[PDB]
Design a protein around this ligand. Sequence first.
Ligand SMILES: [Mg+2]
Ligand SMILES: [Mg+2]
Ligand SMILES: [Mg+2]
Ligand SMILES: [Mg+2]
Ligand SMILES: [Mg+2]
Ligand SMILES: [Mg+2]
Ligand SMILES: [Mg+2]
Ligand SMILES: [Mg+2]
Ligand SMILES: [Mg+2]
Ligand SMILES: [Mg+2]
Ligand SMILES: [Mg+2]
Ligand SMILES: [Mg+2]
Ligand SMILES: [Mg+2]
Ligand SMILES: [Mg+2]
Ligand SMILES: [Mg+2]
Ligand SMILES: [Mg+2]
Ligand SMILES: [Mg+2]
Ligand SMILES: [Mg+2]
Ligand SMILES: [Mg+2]
Ligand SMILES: [Mg+2]
Ligand SMILES: [Mg+2]
Ligand SMILES: [Mg+2]
Ligand SMILES: [Mg+2]
Ligand SMILES: [Mg+2]
Lengths: 129, 123, 82, 80, 157, 205, 32
Amino acid sequence: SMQDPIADMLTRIRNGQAANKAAVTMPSSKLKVAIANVLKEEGFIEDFKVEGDTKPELELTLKYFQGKAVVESIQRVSRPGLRIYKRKDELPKVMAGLGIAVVSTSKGVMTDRAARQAGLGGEIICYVA
Amino acid sequence: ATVNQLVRKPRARKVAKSNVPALEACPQKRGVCTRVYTTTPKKPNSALRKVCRVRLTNGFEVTSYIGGEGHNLQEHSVILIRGGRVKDLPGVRYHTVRGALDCSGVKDRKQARSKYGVKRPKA
Amino acid sequence: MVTIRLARHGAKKRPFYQVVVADSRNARNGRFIERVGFFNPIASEKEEGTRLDLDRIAHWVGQGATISDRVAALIKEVNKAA
Amino acid sequence: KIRTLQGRVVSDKMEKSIVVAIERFVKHPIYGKFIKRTTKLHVHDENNECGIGDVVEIRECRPLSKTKSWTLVRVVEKAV
Amino acid sequence: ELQEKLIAVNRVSKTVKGGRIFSFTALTVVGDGNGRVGFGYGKAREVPAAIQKAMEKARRNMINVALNNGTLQHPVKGVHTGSRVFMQPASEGTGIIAGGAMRAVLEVAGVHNVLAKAYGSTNPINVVRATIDGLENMNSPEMVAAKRGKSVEEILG
Amino acid sequence: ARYLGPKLKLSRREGTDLFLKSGVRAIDTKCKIEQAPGQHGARKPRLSDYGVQLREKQKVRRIYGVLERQFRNYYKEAARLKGNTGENLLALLEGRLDNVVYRMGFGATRAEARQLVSHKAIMVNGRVVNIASYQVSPNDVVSIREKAKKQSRVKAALELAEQREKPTWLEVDAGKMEGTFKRKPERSDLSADINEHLIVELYSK
Amino acid sequence: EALLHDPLFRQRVEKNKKGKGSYMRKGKHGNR
RNA sequence: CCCGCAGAAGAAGCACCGGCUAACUCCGUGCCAGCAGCCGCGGUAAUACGGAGGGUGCAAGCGUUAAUCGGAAUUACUGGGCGUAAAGCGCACGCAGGCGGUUUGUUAAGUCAGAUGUGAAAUCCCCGGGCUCAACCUGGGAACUGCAUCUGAUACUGGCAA
RNA sequence: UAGCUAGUAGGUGGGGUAACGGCUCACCUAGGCGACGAUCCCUAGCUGGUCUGAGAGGAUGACCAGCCACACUGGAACUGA
Ligand SMILES: [Mg+2]
Ligand SMILES: [Mg+2]
Ligand SMILES: [Mg+2]
Ligand SMILES: [Mg+2]
Ligand SMILES: [Mg+2]
Ligand SMILES: [Mg+2]
Ligand SMILES: [Mg+2]
Ligand SMILES: [Mg+2]
Ligand SMILES: [Mg+2]
Ligand SMILES: [Mg+2]
Ligand SMILES: [Mg+2]
Ligand SMILES: [Mg+2]
Ligand SMILES: [Mg+2]
Ligand SMILES: [Mg+2]
Ligand SMILES: [Mg+2]
Ligand SMILES: [Mg+2]
Ligand SMILES: [Mg+2]
Ligand SMILES: [Mg+2]
Ligand SMILES: [Mg+2]
Ligand SMILES: [Mg+2]
Ligand SMILES: [Mg+2]
Ligand SMILES: [Mg+2]
Ligand SMILES: [Mg+2]
Ligand SMILES: [Mg+2]
């Protein structure tokens, strides 16, 4: 019963790619927008819209490159039933550095190398590949 | 398989049992060898397999297989029991070292004589 | 009492003493408080045959530890400086 | 400093003595969950300073009675 | 050169009304040695008649796979029909450390250093379809950066 | 702890000259060599997957005269060291002493090079050493002791080593009977018939 | 009797190489 | 440890060879002897048994047995499954327990960073050094994944309040 | 193997030990522990580490070393830091 709204965000992204759709909508949350801003900065997503006043309907717009899905392997790591907290040195490398690993740290959400650049770690949210 | 269900009841791999109940971690055992006899195998094969029902030292009474071609055993002989199943005689799960304590080695053997204890041709 | 003695390590006929700080009622190789330098009776003409942390050794003399006689000769052999 | 430790009162049916209950979030070794875990300690007090179901600041003092070596300091957020 | 390679050969049956006729399947993999591979599967009534037949279909299914001077770009999974093949890049892992029917594909691919383990079933036909699906599903650093980010050195580090 | 058998029967199983019988006559000049290696050797083998890696490993051991207990111990140090473990194995087999003497031309065979070493006739770095497994340090000197001065093999082998390739990572002084060990040998600089990658896969089974 | 009802002395049936009950998976050799 | 004294003079066995797994075809036996780890070999034309010759793999060791782990992703945390193959309580309610939409403020237990104390020594690894080289011995270091306290970040989880 | 304990959970006072304490007595209170597993049965010295394993883990912990326990069996006390 929507016990993890973050994975509800990733599922729409994953299914939107398989459905060959343009945009995906969902009820917003500040943690959801923060992750998408990391997905936008890396280029996995295409210019989100946060339209809404009292019921904020967050709208990402999917991205395709060579007639194929760009976000093809996404999964949530730190599930609400099982949370993973990596330190500075235990921070992974998705696709040997080719994929990112969104990790919420003290400064905020940032990529796994950006947390390694700042020299801090925390809750790895999702592996995007 | 629900990690919250694993903290409550852990993964438990059943311990594999030894093929031989020969007083654990004893490679060889000493026997008394009552009733040397011969039996026939299961349906694929056919022979008079020479065996003997050994009263072991520790207190068990098992049956062991006599290797080699022809033996020199009797109603009472102190033999040495080596583990090993034949999977051709029902219940035989031990071999007898030819060339041990009292059980002598085979006669006229040339190829594999460390097995069956033949020394060497002294000619 | 506390003492500063030797711990016969090494091999058969190739000894090696590690200068330890231990209680006098131990088994020469056992329970020790702090090892301080070593000694090599079969050392070469090379740079290192004997190392001693004299700052720590003089720290234990103040605490009341007694130096063994073979260890006392190494203080004389090192001449306290070089 | 002081090394205090906070826990909730599980029972107060004793004379000049209370057993407390301290929760501690332990990371499970083999798996990765941060499961919950209790702890019972016999806290000493003055008269009956804490009631039932209250959190209380405890400090490990000198050994009092048989398996009883804890003492309270404050009863913060009491029965009311 | 194209590096033909035999992997497995069986004896299937049919059971006609009289007796049974034995066809011989032959699974071969070809590959130039530069990331181009291809597997042929074909059967005939004779053993050498099928390997020649499996050479023909092998050159029809030539697939190009990127590689980093003799090895993979990143680790990759290879699920196909009960075969859970896993592959590791092994940057100078020194050797094609892989099982039977998974070695022969990666040899003729032109790959030299991998770590691999065939999980699940170890059926030769499916494990070949596992790696062929597994290798073509692997990206390239320039191929990923072409999609998003638009700078090969900026995304990598 | 040595082979002590027919030399070029080992080359017959491989099908190539392993230089362990080499004087002047190439390959028996006659009957059979680089061919049938036994009684039923005229029948061609099938060379299975294990055997291709096996005969690759056996070939290298027959070259340097290293047994399996010892060669595996070179593999331990080769694998734990940095760089390419396939390359470090041929590095440690090269630095082995009897190889170094053989590369000097001081002995005409890797077996003969052990004969000179074992019978205390070679002073490496000035010191007489009879260990055939002596891993020669880089930037070192190897030398023949005076009791082996012109003792009928040193003269005969050094003149035989004129048809060699005169290995680039070394400096032999033919006429002073003293060698000089230069840098670590480069991978591409040695024989290069050996598929070193088949060896590393065998022990990693 | 008892010296004939011994389990050795039983009618032995041979697996014929061809005909009814002749099929073998791999046989004595499997050289490929 | 060096020097000197002879004629190569004193110094090679063990298992295996149907497949797995490197390596054969001829005699003797004839579902009888026997082999075996498993699939299974032996019925008078055996590459599996017993000898011989020839090879292979190891080599002063080589095999066999016992025992642990690995292959076993066949107890799966990393790393599995449950329509039919072993496996969804017959169903529903429900305490303990597990998890939990969204916003702001705050605290700073979980979490992350740094430091200090400790994590004995020897071992396990990294450069060095010394016994003719290695095994061994040994210097320094790293590590000892941990625990506690102190000082910060405080996004996410938890607590409290609205 | 689901209830176990009655000096057992606790208080005051006396005594005792190098030292605190049901460690031991008297009186009073009636609790304490338990499904995050108490009592009971079987088995076993613990650890640094060792063997194996890609890691994670599993198994075992002889030799070297720290600690505990025991010294024909059961029990107690004296000398003495
Ligand atoms: Mg007490
Ligand atoms: Mg097809
Ligand atoms: Mg040896
Ligand atoms: Mg073969
Ligand atoms: Mg035979
Ligand atoms: Mg022979
Ligand atoms: Mg096993
Ligand atoms: Mg396992
Ligand atoms: Mg399963
Ligand atoms: Mg149902
Ligand atoms: Mg039912
Ligand atoms: Mg929440
Ligand atoms: Mg909650
Ligand atoms: Mg910390
Ligand atoms: Mg050291
Ligand atoms: Mg740490
Ligand atoms: Mg509220
Ligand atoms: Mg009192
Ligand atoms: Mg008193
Ligand atoms: Mg494993
Ligand atoms: Mg244990
Ligand atoms: Mg003992
Ligand atoms: Mg012990
Ligand atoms: Mg006694």
